[PDB]
Amino acid sequence: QDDSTPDSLFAGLVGEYYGTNSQLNNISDFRALVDSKEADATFEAANISYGRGSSDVAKGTHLQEFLGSDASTLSTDPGDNTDGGIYLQGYVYLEAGTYNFKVTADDGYEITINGNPVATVDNNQSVYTVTHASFTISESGYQAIDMIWWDQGGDYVFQPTLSADGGSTYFVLDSAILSSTGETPY
Numbered sequence: 586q587d588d589s590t591p592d593s594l595f596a597g598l599v600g601e602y603y604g605t606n607s608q609l610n611n612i613s614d615f616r617a618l619v620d621s622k623e624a625d626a627t628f629e630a631a632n633i634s635y636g637r638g639s640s641d642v643a644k645g646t647h648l649q650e651f652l653g654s655d656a657s658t659l660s661t662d663p664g665d666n667t668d669g670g671i672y673l674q675g676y677v678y679l680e681a682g683t684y685n686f687k688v689t690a691d692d693g694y695e696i697t698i699n700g701n702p703v704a705t706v707d708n709n710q711s712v713y714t715v716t717h718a719s720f721t722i723s724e725s726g727y728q729a730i731d732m733i734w735w736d737q738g739g740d741y742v743f744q745p746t747l748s749a750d751g752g753s754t755y756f757v758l759d760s761a762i763l764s765s766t767g768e769t770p771y
């Protein structure tokens with residue numbers, strides 16, 4: 586806790602959605618959007634496997650469809666924009682050891698753990714899956730995590746999977762291991 590507002594405890598990350606009518610070309614553009622205003626909607630990101638869909642995430646009900654099982658936690662239904670994206674933050678339970686992400690996305694994204702980038706695509710792209718380099722966790726427990734992802738338009742998908750076993754199996758980040766505050770969710 587770091588202010589005077591109690592924070593919701595749930596098995597997920599704290600999600601924020603931002604839309605814009607400017608072009609998002611890269612991570613910097615999306616982070617600047619996040620900095621520029623209050624979120625257009627908030628949600629609980631408890632099953633981080635979104636899309637795929639078409640015809641712009643920021644239009645109509647496409648965000649709801651993209652978020653799927655998480656859309657019932659939306660604070661509002663945003664109005665139309667051309668471009669948009671999400672900012673997720675909270676905690677993930679990981680034992681000490683080596684891990685790596687494998688992420689399918691359109692457009693780009695950045696994932697950080699304990700403040701260090703561990704999976705980055707700093708550009709727009711049609712759907713593509715990257716196997717990212719491995720990283721280490723020094724101490725078992727809840728690790729800080731954040732993610733950004735955006736859609737510049739067109740198709741959209743975001744599925745960042747994680748392997749604990751050297752790339753032999755991967756899992757989606759979901760309510761089994763996510764925490765919004767770092768306390769244990771029940």
Ligand SMILES: OC[C@H]1O[C@@](CO)(O[C@H]2O[C@H](CO)[C@@H](O)[C@H](O)[C@H]2O)[C@@H](O)[C@@H]1O
Nearest residue numbers: 691692709710711712737738739740741
């Ligand atoms: O290559 C850009 C070109 O492809 C289209 C096809 O619909 O968009 C694709 O590529 C974009 C990244 O440049 C993705 O954002 C998009 O989702 C994907 O459909 C066109 O919009 C543009 O012709």
Ligand SMILES: [Ca+2]
Nearest residue numbers: 588590591592
């Ligand atoms: Ca607080």
Ligand SMILES: [Ca+2]
Nearest residue numbers: 619620622623
């Ligand atoms: Ca903001």
Ligand SMILES: [Ca+2]
Nearest residue numbers: 645662663664
């Ligand atoms: Ca809408």
Ligand SMILES: [Ca+2]
Nearest residue numbers: 634636653654
């Ligand atoms: Ca879905």
Ligand SMILES: [Ca+2]
Nearest residue numbers: 654655656657
């Ligand atoms: Ca739901």
Ligand SMILES: [Ca+2]
Nearest residue numbers: 608668737738
């Ligand atoms: Ca655009």
Ligand SMILES: [Ca+2]
Nearest residue numbers: 737738739740
């Ligand atoms: Ca796109």
